[PDB]
Design an enzyme around this catalytic site. Sequence first.
Site, mmCIF file in Angstrom:
data_model
loop_
_atom_site.group_PDB
_atom_site.id
_atom_site.type_symbol
_atom_site.label_atom_id
_atom_site.label_comp_id
_atom_site.label_asym_id
_atom_site.label_seq_id
_atom_site.Cartn_x
_atom_site.Cartn_y
_atom_site.Cartn_z
ATOM 1 N N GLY A 1 0.794 -1.223 0.000
ATOM 2 C CA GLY A 1 0.000 0.000 0.000
ATOM 3 C C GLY A 1 0.825 1.272 0.000
ATOM 4 O O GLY A 1 1.997 1.269 0.393
ATOM 5 N N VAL B 1 3.115 0.975 3.093
ATOM 6 C CA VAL B 1 3.216 -0.350 3.723
ATOM 7 C C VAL B 1 3.911 -1.297 2.727
ATOM 8 O O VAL B 1 3.566 -1.315 1.543
ATOM 9 C CB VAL B 1 1.853 -0.897 4.239
ATOM 10 C CG1 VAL B 1 1.986 -2.314 4.790
ATOM 11 C CG2 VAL B 1 1.263 0.019 5.301
ATOM 12 N N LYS C 1 5.249 -0.644 7.956
ATOM 13 C CA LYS C 1 4.749 0.704 7.687
ATOM 14 C C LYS C 1 5.799 1.754 8.037
ATOM 15 O O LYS C 1 6.367 1.728 9.127
ATOM 16 C CB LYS C 1 3.435 0.979 8.450
ATOM 17 C CG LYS C 1 2.725 2.263 8.032
ATOM 18 C CD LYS C 1 1.402 2.431 8.730
ATOM 19 C CE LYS C 1 0.693 3.699 8.318
ATOM 20 N NZ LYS C 1 -0.746 3.659 8.699
ATOM 21 N N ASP D 1 -12.326 5.310 10.018
ATOM 22 C CA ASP D 1 -12.287 4.921 8.598
ATOM 23 C C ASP D 1 -12.623 3.425 8.393
ATOM 24 O O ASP D 1 -11.836 2.653 7.839
ATOM 25 C CB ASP D 1 -10.938 5.335 7.956
ATOM 26 C CG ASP D 1 -10.883 5.298 6.438
ATOM 27 O OD1 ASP D 1 -11.955 5.328 5.801
ATOM 28 O OD2 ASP D 1 -9.763 5.233 5.889
#
Length: 273
Positions: free
Chosen positions: A16, A23, A42, A131
């Site tokens: 990501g 990530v 991360k 989220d």
Amino acid sequence: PTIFEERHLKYISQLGKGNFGSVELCRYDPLGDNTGALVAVKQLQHSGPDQQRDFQREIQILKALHSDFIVKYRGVSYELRLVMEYLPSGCLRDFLQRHRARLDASRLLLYSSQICKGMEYLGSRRCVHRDLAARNILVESEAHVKIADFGLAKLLPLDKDYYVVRPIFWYAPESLSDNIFSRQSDVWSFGVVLYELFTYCDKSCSPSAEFLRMMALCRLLELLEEGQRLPAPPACPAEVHELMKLCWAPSPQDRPSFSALGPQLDMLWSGSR
Ligand SMILES: */C=C\C(=O)Nc1cccc(CNc2nc(Nc3ccc(N4CCN(C)CC4)cc3OC)ncc2Cl)c1
């Protein structure tokens, strides 16, 4: 170990990339024999003071959460890096779209229940996700899901049950209007997650596509105030849609808790056989 030595982290691929921070798939192998475990790492890219402090917060929150339905914190690497477990089936949005032909209502109820259990634990730890979407749920296997991306997660102020902070289709009316986030606003987002599941994250009838068809931010609030909600997904069990409607109650105090939703979904799964 609690501390992951930087030199022993071999890069494999990108999992990501956010606006600030990414990530990546790494094999932490200190022996050098290529037998090390695969971990998700991360790190912050461009960042700034605000992002560095919010990342520092995120690490502490993830470190303190211990649930079978919340992505496991593994440790840290010091240029701080957050080391987490690697879920190899990707995100839930991707998974459903790919496996639609095999996944039945019983399996979707199983995920619903798991996300609810994790969401309930999160709430007991006085934490708000902010989220909650099918893209932020990760897949361990066809029978296991885990809540991820706590980058937007905020811990409740000790003297209040809400946070005002200074992807709007998952956001509750109080969130769009007054930027209020509570355990009750996470319930609203869960109702949308429930819609995402029983639509198998179809792009044509996604929360974004359906709301834009029904109506940029004031126009969405106008609908939600008028009582306009997402339609009942095709072939969706009646009782599940009734729970979605209750999660979408205009007043947060009128929305059910994750503690109340949990058994209602668990007993529905038993009915599916
Ligand atoms: C829905 C897109 C997405 O990437 N979501 C997402 C949500 C939460 C956390 C992450 C990244 N962290 C992470 N990832 C994995 N495994 C993982 C996640 C996403 C993907 N993708 C599917 C295919 N495509 C290339 C885009 C990204 C792959 C994988 O690994 C198989 N495990 C643990 C963590 Cl902490 C991403």
